[model samples]
Target: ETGDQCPALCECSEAARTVKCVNRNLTEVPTDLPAYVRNLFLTGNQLAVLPAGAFARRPPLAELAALNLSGSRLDEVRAGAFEHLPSLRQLDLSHNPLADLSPFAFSGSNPSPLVELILNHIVPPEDERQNRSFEGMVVAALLAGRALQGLRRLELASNHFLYLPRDVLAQLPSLRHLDLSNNSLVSLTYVSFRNLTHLESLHLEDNALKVLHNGTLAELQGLPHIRVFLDNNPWVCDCHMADMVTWLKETEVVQGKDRLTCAYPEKMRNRVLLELNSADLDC
Candidate 1:
């Protein structure tokens, strides 16, 4: 391949102006790319650092549509690094090293065309991956109004998440799917997810959760429908977790019960938690 040759990660789709380059261990984004590329996918790679001008130029990429950068190790991003990519529609930033830098590094200036944001093992107060709620000082900075305007999906799972600020829902009006599985959140305000009337799916499995407020989930009311994931999270099968189970079954609107994973009875830590049985939780 020539020095300017496109990486194997790059994929081209003529109809969508799509260009996908997934799962490559690149320290920096390819500076030389086909002019008319779009819909780029750069997921699952070792990209802990990025250059200042990474997304600053390249006019041909203006017709861009969707961009996925999930599972890359990017702890730091230079200021104004994403300055000029004007036509982005959706961006997936799940599971990466976004823990470094202030929120201003991203979510700066006008909230760009980014619509979808994901977080897998991606938490804030970067030092505390378990912290459930991250201060969206940066993401919020991009919004011209009190509430964000164009966001659609937000996913945060399999991280050290512990707390979530209550304003999350009302802050992003366009959000649809919110994932919060595999964290340390034991409970949340029902109103947290209320702001997102467009919400559809909610994942909540594989964590240390034991109790939740009865009316707490009621905040998801305006949603056309909602699906909740349980079956992990060490449900007590007793009062605490049992309450959640009962609620999941009785909810007025649900795509269906997720019953994702259950292993309390077998009670095997450092092992498969799904294998746990009701009796295991007694310990």
Candidate 2:
């Protein structure tokens, strides 16, 4: 409402300092945005490419905190697209057809760190979504360092990951919350949670996890205090899950424990996972 400094096509609210350009079917970012603009919404557009200096085309949006590029046909984001935006905190790139994210897409000169990154459903084409590993060049970029050094929360939910590639998450020293729920993960490997010692809460609900051996839980043992969600998984109550049962009894932080029940071997059905003794886990 009455944002005279806002871009021509974008709607700006002076009271909120937010610029909204929703479903405009535009091809590129509007130019000459106000300097004090904080949140910019460009959702549901036809933005196919983001070349270098895209956001720096005109007078920069220096205080941009949140940017929503969701539900767009974003195919590529070249390096230096998000330069000079030090106050940027959250970036929502969900539901975009982005095949690759350049390592330097957010690489700027002494750029301020980011806090939250929403990358759900921003994978390969839908035909390739089922078994996709959710690996992006930008993921390697984020892991490489300093570009997003202050990142605290990462949302990777709803991205079909058969299982995480080894050591992909180990490097982020500042990460606190991670959401990996609603994927088709069949198992957890040892290095899945390695080196994420600063992690506080982990979301693993609604996956295809049938068992959690000691090796899987061992990867999470290094964290200081972690709360895990283990609900809605089709757990097998055989001896293969003995380690998991042991972990459930030993670990102090867990959610939906009562709902974590066995669904296999007829008699084991409806049995709470934590209540099952080692003898009951015998094959």
Candidate 3:
């Protein structure tokens, strides 16, 4: 006799060990979920605040590996919100209005087993006023939790980041894929990606980057097998960008290389970055 009692609104698949409760208009997580469920999808819910012990209450899900709570209108994630999911590997918390993500939200008794985390478009609405310092504080708070040392794939695209938080990415040394596309990043320094030695793919498309200085170029060159996406940026093709143009010709790490064109200096407008000679960018 199998003892798997599925929640009322959720659909449980014994063969796949998955439970899907999408758009159920539920305010809280279901408590009567089966213990054997490995994947739980509670997307499109109204869970505005995830209090501490939200999932660690009695009848904790000991075997949950993947949890997708994206588009749940989550505003605040209290400390120990995800405490009891010992087997959680992948978590999707994208498309939320998260404002107060506590630094200890991800901390538990032991290290986390999480590998993939998606947090796209989760920035607070108040930050849309172009408050750069507030943006930094939000980023710092988002990554202050140290339990994600084993995380590999992280997606923070469309977060309106004017600049990356210093020394934050270094906390996740095991990261391989980092997506920072569709932001307002103006420039990057050498310290931007320090200690991310295992990074493989970096997405920086659709930003406000004008040029990549030597220091930033050196950091990218030092990385092992890194593929970068740099399309849709307003690049100013001047003497300052000569180095990047030269590097683009030599290296094949940049995706959409053909689209890298000049957006400044009326004379150099629409000129392909790779075709410009050193003399063309005379200082």
Candidate 4:
């Protein structure tokens, strides 16, 4: 039997690799991990910040692939938190108190390929209060953090944001999927969705966006088979949205459009998407 009886935590299956002290009140990250352990799930813990060399010192774990650190009270994560471990593939940092994510914070280089990065707690930076929202210096500032190399899918769900830095997604040329649901977006103006040419799946559900421009969708040239989620958005079917209605119809894949309806009209809920045209609301 193992010392702390970790092998007894889960059934002796090939999928289960390590033990998790989940939701524990411990102040520090458990570092005494064996090398053979790959998938570590430490979600729902009360830890604030990970200590230096806390995870880098693990032996035999050089083959580690995935690590989960969700549902914690961490606010400001220090830079270079992930210094050297290279075998990482997927890292989950969702449901945390993180605000300012430092540049190069997750500097891991694994030739085995790091595919998915789940930053569900990401604080999507806003355009400064000077120039036009798009022209603000935010784009340059975000591009400076070009550290997440070889990442395929990035999840930035459930955060405060008006608009994501336009060109930041372009830097991640290999990115295919991006999740930006539950934000404060009102309208998508005529602007390039920079750095997301390869994006195929986009989750824009549960936001305040009303109309999406046609030329806007045309800008995403590399997105041939796009799956967009527009669920729970306050879509006001007005005369101003004729192009938008046609745009969605022309789009290949749209999420939850079958359940699309008018929120204020009271009797318009549960209506079919095509019938919810611009003149339907009599606007």
Measured by lDDT, the strongest candidate is 3
lDDT of 2: 0.77
lDDT of 2 by residue, 1-283 (tens): 7735678778987678888999889898887777778889999899999777777734567778999999878988777777767678998888886676777776543334588888888765664643433464546656644656677998887767667545446656688988888878888764566556788988888889898878767866556588888788889999888988888887777776767899887889889887899889888
Q: In candidate 3, what are the lDDT values of residues 1-283, reduced to their tens digit? A: 2334678888888878999889997799888888888999999999999888787745778899999999999988887788888889998888888877776777643367889988888887875554345455455544655777888998888988877655557677788988889989998864565456688888999999999998888777677588999998888988998899888898878988988888888889888998998888865
Pairs clashing within candidate 3: none
Question: Global lDDT of each model?
Answer: 0.58, 0.77, 0.81, 0.62
* Pairs with steric clashes in candidate 4: 35-60, 35-61, 169-195, 170-195
Taking every candidate in turn, the Cα RMSD to the unseen true structure, in Å, is 5.6, 2.9, 2.9, 5.1
**Local error of candidate 3 at 206, Å?**
1.1
Candidate 4 C-alpha lDDT tens digits along 1-283: 2353353222112346565657665566665665566777777777777643447763436766888888866654555565555677888888776644544356422222468878675443442432443222223323444655577887877765677545656676777888878877787774466445577888888888776666665654336676778888887665555676666676666766666654544455555556666656555
Query: Which scores higher on TM-score, 1 or 2?
Result: 2
Best-first order by TM-score: 3, 2, 4, 1
Clash pairs for candidate 2: none
lDDT of 3 at 18: 91
Per-prediction TM-score to the true structure, in the order listed: 0.72, 0.86, 0.90, 0.79
What is the per-residue lDDT of model 1 for residues 1-283, given as tens digits with 9 covering 90 to 100?
Answer: 2333354556566555555667767666766666666667777777776555576554546766666777777776555455566676666667665665444454544455667666566553346543423435334433434323676777767766665535555667776777767777776654356555577767776667655656565454445477666545654444344444555555655443444344344443333333334454443
The deviation in Å at residue 255 for candidate 2 is 1.8
